[PDB]
Amino acid sequence: FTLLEIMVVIVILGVLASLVVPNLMGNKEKADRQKVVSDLVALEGALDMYKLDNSRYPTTEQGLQALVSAPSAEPHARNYPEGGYIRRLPQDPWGSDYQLLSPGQCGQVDIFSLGPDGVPESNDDIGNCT
Amino acid sequence: FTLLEIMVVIVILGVLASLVVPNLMGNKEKADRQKVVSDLVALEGALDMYKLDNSRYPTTEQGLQALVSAPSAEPHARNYPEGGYIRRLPQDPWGSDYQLLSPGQCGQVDIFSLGPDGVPESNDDIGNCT
Amino acid sequence: FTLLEIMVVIVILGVLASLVVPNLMGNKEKADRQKVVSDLVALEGALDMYKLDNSRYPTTEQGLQALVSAPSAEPHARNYPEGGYIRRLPQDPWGSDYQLLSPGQCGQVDIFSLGPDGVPESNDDIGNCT
Amino acid sequence: VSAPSAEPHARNYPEGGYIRRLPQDPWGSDYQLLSPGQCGQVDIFSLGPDGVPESNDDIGNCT
Ligand SMILES: [Ca+2]
Ligand SMILES: [Ca+2]
Numbered sequence: 001f002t003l004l005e006i007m008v009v010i011v012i013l014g015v016l017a018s019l020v021v022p023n024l025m026g027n028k029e030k031a032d033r034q035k036v037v038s039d040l041v042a043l044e045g046a047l048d049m050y051k052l053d054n055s056r057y058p059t060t061e062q063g064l065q066a067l068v069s070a071p072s073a074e075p076h077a078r079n080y081p082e083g084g085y086i087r088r089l090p091q092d093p094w095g096s097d098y099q100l101l102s103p104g105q106c107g108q109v110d111i112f113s114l115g116p117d118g119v120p121e122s123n124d125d126i127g128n129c130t
Numbered sequence: 131f132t133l134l135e136i137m138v139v140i141v142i143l144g145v146l147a148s149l150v151v152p153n154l155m156g157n158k159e160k161a162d163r164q165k166v167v168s169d170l171v172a173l174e175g176a177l178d179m180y181k182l183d184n185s186r187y188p189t190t191e192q193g194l195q196a197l198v199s200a201p202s203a204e205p206h207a208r209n210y211p212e213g214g215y216i217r218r219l220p221q222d223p224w225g226s227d228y229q230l231l232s233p234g235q236c237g238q239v240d241i242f243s244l245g246p247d248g249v250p251e252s253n254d255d256i257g258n259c260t
Numbered sequence: 261f262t263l264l265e266i267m268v269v270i271v272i273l274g275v276l277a278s279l280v281v282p283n284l285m286g287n288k289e290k291a292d293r294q295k296v297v298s299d300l301v302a303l304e305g306a307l308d309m310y311k312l313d314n315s316r317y318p319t320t321e322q323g324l325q326a327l328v329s330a331p332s333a334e335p336h337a338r339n340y341p342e343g344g345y346i347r348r349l350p351q352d353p354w355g356s357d358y359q360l361l362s363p364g365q366c367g368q369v370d371i372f373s374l375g376p377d378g379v380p381e382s383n384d385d386i387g388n389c390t
Numbered sequence: 391v392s393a394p395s396a397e398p399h400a401r402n403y404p405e406g407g408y409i410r411r412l413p414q415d416p417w418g419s420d421y422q423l424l425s426p427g428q429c430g431q432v433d434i435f436s437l438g439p440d441g442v443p444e445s446n447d448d449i450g451n452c453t
């Protein structure tokens with residue numbers, strides 16, 4: 001009640017807590033990649049839609065928000081659909097949006113972000129080619 | 131048997147119970163968010179299916195139950211699949227369902243619920259944009 | 261606190277961990293197929309575009325990179341579009357690219373790769389007909 | 391759990407089927423499926439904690 005009720009359990013406690021190793025830490029960091037890589041095709045593929053109706057892409061200062069809402073800064077868009085070509089803007093969860101480039105150096109458009117490092121254009125400058 | 135059997139254990143009891151601090155309380159509340167955020171894409175994405183066959187979304191009074199069962203209140207749906215586009219209706223565990231809006235103010239459709247606060251349209255009005 | 265706090269839980273632990281069987285392993289391997297099969301039409305269909313402007317296909321050593329960038333190795337291409345007929349080159353995730361053949365034995369062109377086996381021209385020689 | 395011996399036969403049945411092992415309900419029962427389900431394509435049932443078939447603890451799917 002004092003010893004058997006305790007001593008037997010002290011062992012069972014450590015014996016239990018000792019051989020219970022669930023998993024690692026950092027698997028979410030790997031997930032951050034595909035979350036952004038998923039955006040890549042989704043970004044360019046979505047921009048291509050706007051590149052079809054208005055026959056071109058939005059400006060840097062015009063930002064991806066133009067894909068979210070009608071491009072107030074000129075040039076204006078024709079047959080801009082409801083809410084643009086996206087429901088909402090994917091916010092990079094490190095305090096940054098997906099900064100597009102007008103014109104892109106790897107093609108028609110380039111996109112960039114701080115990324116997990118939280119630094120602009122250092123190592124986690126992903127968003128397109130580089 | 132009376133002192134060693136006890137006094138030694140009284141210490142072991144408190145020494146054990148003192149330095150055993152497992153965790154916090156409230157982690158489940160954080161989980162309630164993703165549980166609802168998971169619905170968000172699942173809700174709109176599922177509604178989009180109905181927006182394809184019948185080329186439109188169900189009415190407010192028609193509710194999300196139309197996604198569960200054939201929409202009895204008109205307009206009627208074409209090629210409505212078996213059991214609609216969902217197995218069962220996700221019940222918000224605070225006494226509320228996911229009230230859709232016909233038409234949505236943030237787009238084609240808007241969804242709302244009481245939420246953890248259990249209040250209608252106060253702070254936990256999540257279900258879509260707002 | 262020592263027995264009820266433990267013994268009841270030891271059961272709940274095993275009772276829980278025992279009847280929680282989520283899924284299999286190897287489903288991704290099945291996905292590797294369609295990922296490559298998706299390339300097949302995308303490869304030949306994309307090459308056909310180059311077969312239109314320059315009225316022919318790129319050379320083996322010229323590789324699919326010619327579809328990525330202007331074909332430096334002659335013959336030269338006419339009206340080669342921006343960045344060629346593709347954004348980027350699909351890299352087979354087993355240390356190999358999609359080796360084209362100039363001329364193909366199953367037609368105008370043939371493509372090959374190591375594949376999941378990681379072996380050249382053994383079993384996972386997919387990329388076109390064979 | 392294993393390839394369906396009773397016909398109809400399955401195509402591209404993966405290794406060991408779609409599960410490691412069968413979850414045994416710890417009250418002397420397995421998860422009895424229904425062919426075809428009344429709440430949809432398939433329905434599942436079990437004795438449950440009551441240990442009674444189709445009384446109160448008939449969970450396994452919709453009902
Ligand atoms: Ca950076
Ligand atoms: Ca509220």
Ligand SMILES: [Ca+2]
Binds near residue numbers: 373374377
């Ligand atoms: Ca091979």
Ligand SMILES: [Ca+2]
Binds near residue numbers: 436438444445448
């Ligand atoms: Ca029963």
